[PDB]
Amino acid sequence: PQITLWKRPLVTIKIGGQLKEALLDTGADDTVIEEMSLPGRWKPKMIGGIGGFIKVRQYDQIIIEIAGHKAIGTVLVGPTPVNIIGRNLMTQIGATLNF
Amino acid sequence: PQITLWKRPLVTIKIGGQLKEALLDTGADDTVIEEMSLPGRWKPKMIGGIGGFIKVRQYDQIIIEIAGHKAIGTVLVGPTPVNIIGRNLMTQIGATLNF
Numbered sequence A, B: 001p002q003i004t005l006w007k008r009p010l011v012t013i014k015i016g017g018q019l020k021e022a023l024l025d026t027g028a029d030d031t032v033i034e035e036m037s038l039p040g041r042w043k044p045k046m047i048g049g050i051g052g053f054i055k056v057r058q059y060d061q062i063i064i065e066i067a068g069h070k071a072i073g074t075v076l077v078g079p080t081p082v083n084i085i086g087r088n089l090m091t092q093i094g095a096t097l098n099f
């Protein structure tokens, strides 16, 4: 699609067998999801934004379906106030900003 | 232009006669820039990101060039780690997300 920015660019994702809503966020380097279980190994990470840092679990090689488009990559899991799809996965679905 | 997301989508802005770099950020409702002087009165605002909230100064009807496009609108000033152009001004320059 072409998604205008009058409202938050929310999309449906599928991750870990679960359907969720997430924000397409060009200002996020990494994808960060609210607490949930994911399979395999993880390692701890700190990520920072406005407000400061939160501690997250970094899971690699996670498949996510984003608006119907499959992508694989790193997913960070932790106490984010919103599920955010970052550039690491947006590149994989061919997302661009146009003006 | 068409901006891919392999790198941070940084653009040049001009505000108060000064060039700055800023991030086109679809996950930001609001434009928030690092401390600087702007004309007129400001109003209080709290914004919440990853990390928690911060207090900012809200300036309305500020003239700002973004990647060579004129916008006039609300600019928040506060301790953001990076200058961020949010949806409020990205809509003024006609930006969309496409995939």
Ligand SMILES: CC(C)CN(C[C@@H](O)[C@H](Cc1ccccc1)NC(=O)O[C@H]1CO[C@H]2OCC[C@H]21)S(=O)(=O)c1ccc(N)cc1
Binding pocket: A025, A026, A027, A028, A029, A030, A031, A032, A047, A048, A049, A050, A081, A082, A084, A086, B023, B025, B026, B027, B028, B029, B030, B031, B032, B047, B048, B049, B050, B082, B084, B086
């Ligand atoms: C501040 C940016 C440089 C970085 N952020 C992404 C940004 O899009 C967040 C993403 C976001 C969105 C909602 C809540 C928390 C974080 N937006 C944000 O803080 O926007 C604030 C300004 O406008 C407001 O509208 C949204 C909250 C306000 S971040 O959420 O801190 C972040 C940092 C690292 C990663 N990997 C992923 C996300």
Ligand SMILES: [Cl-]
Binding pocket: A072, A073, A074, A088, A089
């Ligand atoms: Cl990745």
Ligand SMILES: [Cl-]
Binding pocket: A094, B004
């Ligand atoms: Cl590409």
Ligand code: NA
Binding pocket: A039, A040, A041, A059, A060, A061, A062
């Ligand atoms: Na893994």
